[PDB]
Symmetry: C3
Subunit: 321 residues, 3 copies
């Protein structure tokens, strides 16, 4: 609730109502709590690339008067050995087991980004890495996208849907789209997780074989007919993700371009808004025209990433010992 | 004094008062440290940089600003620059989304985007730097675009004023041999600014290396290096790849007789040696010349902090 | 002592007693001097990789209210030509002779990391690069590990030994350990240098051939029998380093795994603490069990890097013109 010790799943945010309250409070008065994080240091660690999370999170920290240190492992640091009990006589000069505690020594709050490795479903879904940070960093840890979730993103999506909805409980449809490379299911999982927490009419549509883990799908409606799902929707949340079930974990089952959210599908919606977490591959995930259309709130959405981050960062600060 | 961007000498307005603030700040570096409080500067790099990279952060700090340095390609996603393509490859993100997005998290934007030498029009129409101006939603200042480098030139002006022995010195910009094809942004920019002064400006380069007229202006072009150097008070050496006709962005020569050495300096009125840096020793200039006491290369570089602080200040002062 | 103009060797710190005093003063009140470095800018330059020095030094600077700019040459900047009088018609666009002065132009204090290049002993041991910074930067320079020393690290090791010792003058044993790659002798040299400055019972143990330079070894006891050296020790400081003498400068003479600090050797010590500057290759330098044992103060040690840096940075500030 109001005792945030970490930020990885929607549960951590507590009551959505009051969470959204603070969100809009801050949208209105961006530097209202610029004094709260004074002399508090945030350490942002990146195991993967990032534009939005990278930029938005620093800004957020600044809104709170915090200190920010961005660390891109692999670049300026030493490669990390993730497995325990191995003889470190090669590629890796340092072991994750030392790295984590050490990083925790120089900051107050930690943000981590560690994409699913798609080498072993269990390792990814048990969220081994993000958890080792939680266990051994000795600091509050918030996700900048783990192997199976991306709360900071979803929380922002929530904020923008509330921000733009025309009715109390809109029809929000998350749709799969073709992509050339195998992507994590973190965003979809996370979106579903958050949408299920609302009372919106949530629908998930994807090709056969791309079923997401039940624990995330929840009791949301799954429609295999994209056109049917889109019917009368108020929000379209497009995002690609590699397979998850059985022998296809982390694999591309298809690149059926008929799923590319184009003008054809949008037409069937109730003049719905188009959303996407970004990056977005144009004419793969969505048409140039759709993303450029006025119903596309892609940027406003991205912008809200600063808010969700400022709210989470604030809560974390408020709970620092 | 309502600066909305900073890409060409026009943006600075009256040079006199611009130089005034420059020296004001040289004297009292943190005089306006309170001005940029709670204002965030986003520096974006599409190319390498030491001086611009360092000097601009310091400048922002002098104004009490927040600074975020972003090196695309490194921590971010590769950008697709062309519109209407099917992004099914190398690029995960399109510039059309990237720009607006970056603008979302800052108050002022600084961009560095070297000429790509793939198409003269694309470069000279300054497509990229302009798309930032058009879609970032924030004031944009150049950290060197395809055809200009105001921050650098403005600094060169400051140092010439700072060191000149007479009111209107003879400033000679000279080409020099280089192993790789370099943009003409620095030369173009220097010429642009020198033409704005009332100094005796002269441009000297090998045949074929003529810069665009709009930049050359009505400056004197001398193809005989030794003749140009005669009695000069300032030597501004810099290499640049060809520009005209079928040689856009190409190396026409590496004639080492142009390497600014002791031979040419001797003919000048004990002139100062200047260069924006990086500089390849014994290519652009002799070890001895750059190391000589007439070489104000560092003082020059140092002034990059001032030009940046002045520009950054003006931009802040005009923020809504 | 209160006239710090640089920080590269133990001499620069002055009286160890008062140095340790400030150290613990700051451990207790971390932001006590947060106002001292206001409007002062620190420039950290890296010619090599780093996690601890990279992170700990920024935090330190922040504790002093300073401004921090981290520069990783090679990455965002232009490759530097280190030799003078060459015709720069190749790989290098910029020369070190211009780079150094230029970097000094935009900051108040400079921190440099430049590992030994192992291309020429004299060049390394005369500390040419670190010195050129001192000579031409025009600013106070502190080492983030040069070719032959690493004061920031050693000073921290001192702090932690003082912090954990059970007696006034403990037996501290620095031990060599097998490694797959040729490492600088900067850490060993530096540790010896500092331990020789104390009145602890200092012992150095390494295989034949790995003798460190006399000027660093000082009059410390050198034991070629690891097990003998470990006997009754109170602190074990393990660290690998490539050869130094004669025709083997910067070369791996052996990878004898019998030196891997394991449970076998620890047993012979007076239940000694295990220390290491990190990065550490597990099961090469030290056993998983040893480093994970409770006698392992590896992290507390790393943590102290923030203190040593804050103290040094403070002293430097206090002496700024
Ligand atoms: C703080 C120690 C820095 C460095 N370490 C390395 O270069 C380690 C390389 C490796 O582990 O492969 C050294 O031994 O001097
Ligand atoms: C915001 C998170 C985006 C990330 N996507 C990618 O890694 C994109 C790579 C590509 O488009 O090639 C993902 O699906 O988790
Ligand atoms: C400020 C100067 C930037 C750049 N210089 C280079 O890119 C030189 C590259 C080299 O020397 O290899 C140019 O000519 O525009």
């Amino acid at each position: 609730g109001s005792h945030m010790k970490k930020f990885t799943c929607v549960q951590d945010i507590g009551d959505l109502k009051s969470a959204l309250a603070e969100s809009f409070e801050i949208k209105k008065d961006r530097f209202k709590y610029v004094e709260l994080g004074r002399n508090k240091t945030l350490l942002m660690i990146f195991f993967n690339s990032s534009l939005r999370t990278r930029l938005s999170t620093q800004k957020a920290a600044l809104n709170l008067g915090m200190n920010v240190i961005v660390l891109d492992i692999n670049q300026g640091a030493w490669k990390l050995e993730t497995e325990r009990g191995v003889i470190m006589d090669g590629d890796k000069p340092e072991h994750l087991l030392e790295a984590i505690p050490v990083m925790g020594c120089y900051c107050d709050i930690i943000g981590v980004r560690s994409f699913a490795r798609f080498e072993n479903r269990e390792y990814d879904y048990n969220e081994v890495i993000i958890n080792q940070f939680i266990q051994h960093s000795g600091r509050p840890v918030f996700s900048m996208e783990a192997a199976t979730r991306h709360p900071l993103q979803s929380f922002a999506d929530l904020i923008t849907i509330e921000e733009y909805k025309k009715t109390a409980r809109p029809k929000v449809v998350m749709t799969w789209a073709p992509h050339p490379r195998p992507l994590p299911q973190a965003v979809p999982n996370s979106f579903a997780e958050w949408m299920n927490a609302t009372d919106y009419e949530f629908v998930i549509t994807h090709p056969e074989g791309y079923e997401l883990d039940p624990k995330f799908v929840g009791n949301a409606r799954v429609e295999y007919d994209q056109m049917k799902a889109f019917e009368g929707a108020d929000f379209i949340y497009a995002k690609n993700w590699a397979a998850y079930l059985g022998d296809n974990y982390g694999q591309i089952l298809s690149t059926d371009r008929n799923w590319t959210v184009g003008d054809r599908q949008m037409a069937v919606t109730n003049n719905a808004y188009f959303m996407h977490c970004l990056p977005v591959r144009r004419n793969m995930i969505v048409t140039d025209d759709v993303i450029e259309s006025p119903q596309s709130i892609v940027i406003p959405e991205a912008a809200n990433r600063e808010i969700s981050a400022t709210v989470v960062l604030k809560r974390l600060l408020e709970n620092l010992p």
